[PDB]
Amino acid sequence: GCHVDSRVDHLFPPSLYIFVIGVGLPTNCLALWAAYRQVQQRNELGVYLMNLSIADLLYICTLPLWVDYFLHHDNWIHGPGSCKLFGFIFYTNIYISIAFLCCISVDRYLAVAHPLRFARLRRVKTAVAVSSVVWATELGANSAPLFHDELFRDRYNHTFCFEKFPMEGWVAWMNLYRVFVGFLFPWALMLLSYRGILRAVRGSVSTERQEKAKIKRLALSLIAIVLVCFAPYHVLLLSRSAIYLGRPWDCGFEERVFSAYHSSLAFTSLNCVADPILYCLVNEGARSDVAKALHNLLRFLAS
Amino acid sequence: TASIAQARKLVEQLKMEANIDRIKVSKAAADLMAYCEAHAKEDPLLTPVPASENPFR
Amino acid sequence: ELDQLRQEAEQLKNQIRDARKACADATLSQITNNIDPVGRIQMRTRRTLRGHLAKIYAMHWGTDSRLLVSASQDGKLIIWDSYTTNKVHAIPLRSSWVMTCAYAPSGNYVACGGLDNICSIYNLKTREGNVRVSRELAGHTGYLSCCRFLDDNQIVTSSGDTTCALWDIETGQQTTTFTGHTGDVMSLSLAPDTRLFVSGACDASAKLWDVREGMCRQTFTGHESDINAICFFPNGNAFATGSDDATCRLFDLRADQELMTYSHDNIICGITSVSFSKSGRLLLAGYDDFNCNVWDALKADRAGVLAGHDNRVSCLGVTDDGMAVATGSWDSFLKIWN
Amino acid sequence: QVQLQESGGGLVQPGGSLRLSCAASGFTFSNYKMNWVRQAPGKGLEWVSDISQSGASISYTGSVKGRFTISRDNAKNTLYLQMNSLKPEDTAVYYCARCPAPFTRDCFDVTSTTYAYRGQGTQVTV
Amino acid sequence: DQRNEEKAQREANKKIEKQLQKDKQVYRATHRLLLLGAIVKQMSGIFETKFQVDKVNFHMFDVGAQRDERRKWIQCFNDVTAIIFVVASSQTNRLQAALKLFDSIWNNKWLRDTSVILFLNKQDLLAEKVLAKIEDYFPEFARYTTPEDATPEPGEDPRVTRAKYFIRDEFLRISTASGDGRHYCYPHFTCAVDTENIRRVFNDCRDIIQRMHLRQYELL
Ligand SMILES: CC(C)CCC[C@@H](C)[C@H]1CC[C@H]2[C@@H]3CC=C4C[C@@H](O)CC[C@]4(C)[C@H]3CC[C@]12C
Ligand SMILES: CC(C)CCC[C@@H](C)[C@H]1CC[C@H]2[C@@H]3CC=C4C[C@@H](O)CC[C@]4(C)[C@H]3CC[C@]12C
């Protein structure tokens, strides 16, 4: 047990989560609808977008109990089973999202860089098998917290859920894993995939230079929106774990970084709200399909 | 030049088309109307059959 | 003396026009001006037949009003069970460029054809359950645009070589040829008595043919562009034609004239398929604007729209019992409506 | 019934001028692109000119640019070909070809075989 | 109680759909091509020649016994990967007829998404006729200049390259009058004896499929 300053933890992280829920429920539903429309047109990318939107929907569904928790200055006010289930979703999802972003990257790379070559790898069946494998490996590689304790009543009046001060060793190594594999590997693969997509688009003759510029802007937007919103949390997590592995007997870093840590968590949700915006509404066909669907639904429900 | 047999067959077909028995379009219209009236009940698309008689629902 | 023959032809067609106008007493609009409108015909999609890979060009119902044949440019003929949505037969074709297909009124044969210039007949009932090519009718020098069975041994074929042909299937020979069109023939339609068929071509003309005599009885004009679809009215005394001029027209044999025009100002696409209902009261027309319109054949009013295809409607068929209508499209889907 | 009557041909001195006219009937004239097609004595059909439905887009074959001019009067259902500075290369039969379908930007109508929407032509001799 | 007929029809359906999945896999891997001309030994109503480049299958179709009126059967070729348009670069005005046909194929509402691979052939005869006629058909030639972004092939005067590039520009005027991104014209130069023609067609088909994939994968 050590000190923790909760000056903004009960304001900023709830405010953000509220904005995230309010904006991301409609957008993630529309994104899931457009992805289903794509997969019913025989398009793998629709399968991956469907899984992305499902992960984000789950994350948004468990946010209310986190804004409740943060409004209580980190007070769980629930039972340990709720803590386990929901806290497990609060992180597993953030990584399932990054993994399906990597899947969309590699699928686009296969389509654009090597057309005429890999057809088996570009079937809806293969997309479904890969999505199932991704869900399985993520939910099994981030299952270690489910075999431990997650509710802790420090003497500081904060009933922590999935977070302890100082931390343990297994959570230090789980943190190293979550930073280096679960974040840096899919992001590096995305960077490489979009680099390949950009060189292949440079080789294009039937594409105007403007279109090339638009594609480059979209790719840089994807990479940067992932990094800007997931990098602060993970540099802080990695610093915490390194200082701990270095000297578990010390709470200066937690005292000085505890208020930036949960702000970083809040910043990650922005990805969950960000994903549907880019991967659905930057495009012409998906915007047109969702506009048609919404206008029709409203109109002929009014009848 | 070579269209002589074409033109003579054209005039032959035309003179075989001109000499036929035509009826007034009022009588033909009345016949079409009578066929539509006499067979209106036997038309599932004009008068939809109940759901117990529809092989598609 | 070519000028002499042209003068004779012009005077003869003037005589034909005067004889036609001498019979135009009252417009159909004036005779059906007091009959009740049909209201709003609302049809619903009951079946969506999936399985074709490429665009659908042809579709024929069976006389049992349950089985269907569809031809797609992937190279397959599929025999559908409309009730259970199952596939009864999938026949791979030698040429994938099929433009027409036809189900035999007996249920034993199915024909197809296209850019190979050949009418291939397939046996559906063999002792080993195999679908075989019974006969390949060669002799057309242009593409094969429409096939229609007279019986199990006779078939009528339209072609891009401006000629129609009547074939003896067992001998594989061409019994009678029907010349007289100037543009490539697009669609045929047999009369209910199988003694007369009507032909629609890319010269804005429709010709009535005697199947036995081999001669052209009447020639109908009135369209401005190529005629893409033709269909006999159930009585056999009239027929409807749809053209690339965004217009469908009702002609009558015994009057030798056009009786009604089916056009609207906001329709600027060609008609791809026409079919009548069992009563002959409705006229379903397929259009290039992705949907089918339902016309009141007696009042020239638009009674309904069949939306639900995301590409060009190519096929349109009504069952012999009049229960359902089938629509084919270039989106590779067959839909059944009721 | 679609008819296209061409008039105005005749024998002209090398260097003179003519005015061919095409009277249309049996279709909405203002809905179709119209053309002028030529057929030299021992050659096939050659395209000459092309006017749009309104008269804004006009194109000619290269050998007749600056010399010929095409116009249409949608109110009178007529098409005109004013020919200036005629050469003996212009001696041919001039047909008035209508494009097959309305409201389109493409035409397939120079076929040596029977194209349907084409008049019988007028003879120009130089 | 005839559940037997129903289960037999469902088993037949299962066999049919298994065969349909396999022939679908075969269909998506084959690229259809239309050979429209004014080659048979390069490498009925319609002739088919199958090739293979880098283990990719191509099916080329040249129309045989069909009448010169094309407006009805050209709608069957709206889903091909590309139309290969072969022009004899140059006694009628065959070049203007080629330009007219290309304009009709380009502005057809059904070929509005079909890219064209253009092959301007007969350049040996074109060369020996330029040196020695084309300006009897095209007046803008006597006032046309070879572009600067043009390949300086070794051995040939600016005259033949001027003719070649003037004809290529005559086609590119039609091809760019649209300005909408839905289908493209890949102009190439062909000789009497060549070997890289199949490579050019393969590269252009790779480009067409890649553009279609950029559109399909929400990347454009
Ligand atoms: C077109 C389809 C086949 C492309 C599929 C790309 C898949 C196989 C790539 C993209 C994302 C990658 C995953 C990214 C993250 C992880 C978690 C790690 O602990 C094990 C490797 C693993 C599981 C990778 C496996 C391979 C992977 C799933
Ligand atoms: C612990 C529990 C809640 C985990 C549940 C994971 C479920 C929701 C994941 C794993 C497998 C995924 C499915 C894989 C295949 C398909 C078929 C596709 O056409 C629609 C998406 C869909 C239906 C996915 C929906 C989401 C999915 C069902």
CSV table of N, CA, C and O in Angstrom, one decimal, chain A residues 38 42-43 45 107-108 111-113 115-117 122-123 125 197 200-201 204-207 211 215 218 283, chain E residues 18 21 24-25 28 31 54-56 58 184 186 202 205-207 209-211 213-214 216-220:
chain,number,residue,atom,x,y,z
A,38,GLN,N,-21.2,-5.4,-46.0
A,38,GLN,CA,-20.0,-5.8,-46.8
A,38,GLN,C,-19.9,-7.3,-46.8
A,38,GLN,O,-19.6,-7.9,-47.9
A,42,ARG,N,-20.0,-10.6,-49.9
A,42,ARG,CA,-18.8,-11.5,-50.0
A,42,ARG,C,-17.5,-10.7,-50.0
A,42,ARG,O,-16.7,-10.6,-50.9
A,43,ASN,N,-17.2,-10.1,-48.8
A,43,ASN,CA,-16.0,-9.3,-48.6
A,43,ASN,C,-15.4,-9.5,-47.3
A,43,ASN,O,-16.0,-9.0,-46.3
A,45,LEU,N,-13.1,-8.0,-45.6
A,45,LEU,CA,-12.9,-6.8,-44.8
A,45,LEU,C,-14.1,-6.6,-43.9
A,45,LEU,O,-14.0,-6.0,-42.8
A,107,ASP,N,-4.8,-7.8,-44.5
A,107,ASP,CA,-5.7,-8.1,-45.6
A,107,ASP,C,-5.6,-7.1,-46.7
A,107,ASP,O,-5.6,-7.5,-47.9
A,108,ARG,N,-5.6,-5.8,-46.4
A,108,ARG,CA,-5.4,-4.8,-47.4
A,108,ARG,C,-4.1,-4.9,-48.1
A,108,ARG,O,-4.0,-4.7,-49.3
A,111,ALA,N,-4.4,-7.7,-50.6
A,111,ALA,CA,-5.3,-7.3,-51.8
A,111,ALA,C,-4.5,-6.4,-52.7
A,111,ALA,O,-4.5,-6.6,-53.9
A,112,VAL,N,-3.9,-5.4,-52.2
A,112,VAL,CA,-3.3,-4.3,-53.1
A,112,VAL,C,-1.9,-4.7,-53.6
A,112,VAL,O,-1.6,-4.5,-54.7
A,113,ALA,N,-1.1,-5.2,-52.7
A,113,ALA,CA,0.3,-5.5,-53.1
A,113,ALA,C,0.4,-6.8,-53.9
A,113,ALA,O,1.1,-6.8,-54.9
A,115,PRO,N,-2.2,-8.7,-55.6
A,115,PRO,CA,-3.4,-9.3,-56.3
A,115,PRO,C,-3.0,-10.4,-57.2
A,115,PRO,O,-1.8,-10.5,-57.6
A,116,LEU,N,-3.9,-11.2,-57.6
A,116,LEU,CA,-3.7,-12.4,-58.5
A,116,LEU,C,-2.9,-13.5,-57.8
A,116,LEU,O,-2.6,-14.5,-58.4
A,117,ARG,N,-2.6,-13.3,-56.5
A,117,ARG,CA,-1.7,-14.3,-55.9
A,117,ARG,C,-2.4,-15.1,-54.8
A,117,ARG,O,-2.4,-16.4,-54.9
A,122,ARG,N,-8.0,-14.9,-48.9
A,122,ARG,CA,-8.9,-13.8,-49.1
A,122,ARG,C,-10.4,-14.3,-49.3
A,122,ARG,O,-11.1,-13.9,-50.2
A,123,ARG,N,-10.8,-15.3,-48.5
A,123,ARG,CA,-12.1,-15.8,-48.5
A,123,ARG,C,-12.8,-15.6,-47.2
A,123,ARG,O,-12.1,-15.4,-46.2
A,125,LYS,N,-14.5,-17.5,-45.4
A,125,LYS,CA,-14.2,-18.6,-44.6
A,125,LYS,C,-12.9,-18.4,-43.8
A,125,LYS,O,-12.9,-18.4,-42.6
A,197,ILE,N,1.4,-0.9,-48.8
A,197,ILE,CA,0.3,-0.4,-49.6
A,197,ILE,C,0.6,0.9,-50.3
A,197,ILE,O,0.2,1.2,-51.4
A,200,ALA,N,2.9,0.2,-53.3
A,200,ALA,CA,2.2,-0.3,-54.4
A,200,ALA,C,1.3,0.7,-55.1
A,200,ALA,O,1.1,0.7,-56.3
A,201,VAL,N,0.7,1.6,-54.3
A,201,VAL,CA,-0.1,2.7,-54.8
A,201,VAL,C,0.8,3.7,-55.6
A,201,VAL,O,0.4,4.2,-56.6
A,204,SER,N,1.1,2.6,-59.1
A,204,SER,CA,-0.1,2.5,-59.9
A,204,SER,C,-0.1,3.6,-61.0
A,204,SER,O,0.4,4.7,-60.9
A,205,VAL,N,-0.7,3.2,-62.1
A,205,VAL,CA,-0.9,4.0,-63.3
A,205,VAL,C,-2.3,4.6,-63.4
A,205,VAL,O,-2.5,5.7,-63.8
A,206,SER,N,-3.3,3.8,-63.1
A,206,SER,CA,-4.7,4.1,-63.2
A,206,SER,C,-5.2,5.0,-62.0
A,206,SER,O,-6.4,5.1,-61.9
A,207,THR,N,-4.3,5.5,-61.2
A,207,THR,CA,-4.7,6.2,-60.0
A,207,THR,C,-4.0,7.6,-60.1
A,207,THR,O,-2.8,7.7,-60.2
A,211,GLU,N,-5.6,11.0,-55.7
A,211,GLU,CA,-6.0,9.8,-55.1
A,211,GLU,C,-4.9,9.2,-54.3
A,211,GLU,O,-5.1,8.7,-53.1
A,215,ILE,N,-5.0,8.4,-50.3
A,215,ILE,CA,-4.6,7.1,-49.7
A,215,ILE,C,-3.5,7.3,-48.6
A,215,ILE,O,-3.6,6.7,-47.6
A,218,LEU,N,-5.0,8.7,-45.5
A,218,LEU,CA,-5.7,7.7,-44.7
A,218,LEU,C,-4.8,6.8,-44.0
A,218,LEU,O,-5.0,6.5,-42.8
A,283,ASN,N,-15.1,6.8,-45.9
A,283,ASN,CA,-15.2,6.2,-47.2
A,283,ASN,C,-16.6,6.6,-47.8
A,283,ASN,O,-17.5,7.0,-47.1
E,18,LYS,N,-21.6,-28.0,-53.2
E,18,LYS,CA,-20.2,-28.3,-53.1
E,18,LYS,C,-19.5,-28.1,-54.4
E,18,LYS,O,-18.4,-27.4,-54.5
E,21,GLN,N,-19.2,-24.4,-54.9
E,21,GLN,CA,-18.1,-23.7,-54.2
E,21,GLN,C,-16.8,-24.0,-54.9
E,21,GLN,O,-15.9,-23.0,-55.1
E,24,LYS,N,-16.7,-22.0,-58.1
E,24,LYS,CA,-16.5,-20.5,-57.7
E,24,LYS,C,-15.1,-20.2,-57.5
E,24,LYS,O,-14.6,-19.2,-57.9
E,25,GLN,N,-14.4,-21.1,-56.7
E,25,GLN,CA,-12.9,-20.9,-56.5
E,25,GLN,C,-12.2,-20.9,-57.9
E,25,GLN,O,-11.3,-20.1,-58.0
E,28,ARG,N,-13.1,-17.3,-59.7
E,28,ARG,CA,-12.5,-16.1,-59.3
E,28,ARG,C,-11.0,-16.0,-59.6
E,28,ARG,O,-10.4,-14.9,-59.6
E,31,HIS,N,-9.2,-14.8,-65.3
E,31,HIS,CA,-9.4,-13.4,-65.7
E,31,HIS,C,-9.8,-13.4,-67.2
E,31,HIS,O,-9.1,-13.8,-68.1
E,54,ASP,N,3.0,-16.1,-64.8
E,54,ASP,CA,3.3,-16.1,-63.4
E,54,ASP,C,2.2,-16.9,-62.6
E,54,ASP,O,1.8,-16.5,-61.6
E,55,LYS,N,1.8,-18.0,-63.2
E,55,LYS,CA,0.8,-19.0,-62.6
E,55,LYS,C,-0.6,-18.3,-62.5
E,55,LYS,O,-1.3,-18.7,-61.6
E,56,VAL,N,-0.9,-17.3,-63.3
E,56,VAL,CA,-2.2,-16.7,-63.4
E,56,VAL,C,-2.9,-17.1,-64.7
E,56,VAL,O,-2.3,-17.1,-65.7
E,58,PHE,N,-5.6,-16.8,-67.7
E,58,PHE,CA,-6.2,-15.8,-68.6
E,58,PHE,C,-7.0,-16.5,-69.7
E,58,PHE,O,-6.5,-17.4,-70.3
E,184,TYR,N,-10.0,2.7,-67.3
E,184,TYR,CA,-8.8,3.3,-67.7
E,184,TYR,C,-8.4,2.8,-69.1
E,184,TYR,O,-8.8,1.7,-69.5
E,186,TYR,N,-5.0,1.8,-71.2
E,186,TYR,CA,-3.6,1.5,-71.1
E,186,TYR,C,-3.1,1.5,-72.5
E,186,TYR,O,-3.2,0.4,-73.2
E,202,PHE,N,-0.6,-8.7,-68.9
E,202,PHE,CA,-0.5,-9.2,-67.5
E,202,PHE,C,-0.3,-8.0,-66.6
E,202,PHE,O,-1.0,-7.9,-65.5
E,205,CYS,N,-3.5,-6.0,-66.4
E,205,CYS,CA,-4.5,-6.6,-65.7
E,205,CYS,C,-4.2,-6.6,-64.2
E,205,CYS,O,-5.1,-6.5,-63.3
E,206,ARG,N,-3.0,-6.7,-63.8
E,206,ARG,CA,-2.6,-6.5,-62.4
E,206,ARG,C,-2.9,-5.2,-61.9
E,206,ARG,O,-3.3,-5.0,-60.8
E,207,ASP,N,-2.7,-4.2,-62.7
E,207,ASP,CA,-3.1,-2.8,-62.3
E,207,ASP,C,-4.6,-2.6,-62.2
E,207,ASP,O,-5.1,-2.0,-61.3
E,209,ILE,N,-6.9,-5.0,-61.5
E,209,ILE,CA,-7.3,-5.7,-60.3
E,209,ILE,C,-6.9,-4.9,-59.1
E,209,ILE,O,-7.6,-4.9,-58.1
E,210,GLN,N,-5.7,-4.3,-59.1
E,210,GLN,CA,-5.3,-3.6,-57.9
E,210,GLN,C,-6.1,-2.4,-57.7
E,210,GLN,O,-6.4,-2.0,-56.5
E,211,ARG,N,-6.5,-1.7,-58.7
E,211,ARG,CA,-7.4,-0.5,-58.6
E,211,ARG,C,-8.8,-1.0,-58.1
E,211,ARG,O,-9.4,-0.3,-57.2
E,213,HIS,N,-9.3,-3.5,-56.2
E,213,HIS,CA,-9.1,-3.9,-54.8
E,213,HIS,C,-9.0,-2.6,-53.9
E,213,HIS,O,-9.5,-2.7,-52.8
E,214,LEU,N,-8.4,-1.6,-54.4
E,214,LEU,CA,-8.4,-0.3,-53.6
E,214,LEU,C,-9.8,0.2,-53.4
E,214,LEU,O,-10.1,0.7,-52.4
E,216,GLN,N,-12.5,-1.8,-53.5
E,216,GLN,CA,-13.3,-2.8,-52.7
E,216,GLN,C,-12.9,-2.8,-51.2
E,216,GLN,O,-13.7,-3.1,-50.4
E,217,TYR,N,-11.6,-2.6,-51.0
E,217,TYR,CA,-11.1,-2.6,-49.6
E,217,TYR,C,-11.1,-1.3,-48.9
E,217,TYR,O,-10.3,-1.0,-48.0
E,218,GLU,N,-12.1,-0.4,-49.3
E,218,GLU,CA,-12.3,0.9,-48.7
E,218,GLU,C,-11.1,1.7,-48.5
E,218,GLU,O,-10.9,2.4,-47.5
E,219,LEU,N,-10.2,1.7,-49.4
E,219,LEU,CA,-8.9,2.4,-49.4
E,219,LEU,C,-8.8,3.5,-50.3
E,219,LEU,O,-7.7,4.1,-50.5
E,220,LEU,N,-9.9,3.9,-51.0
E,220,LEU,CA,-9.8,4.9,-52.0
E,220,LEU,C,-10.9,6.0,-51.7
E,220,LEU,O,-12.1,5.7,-51.7
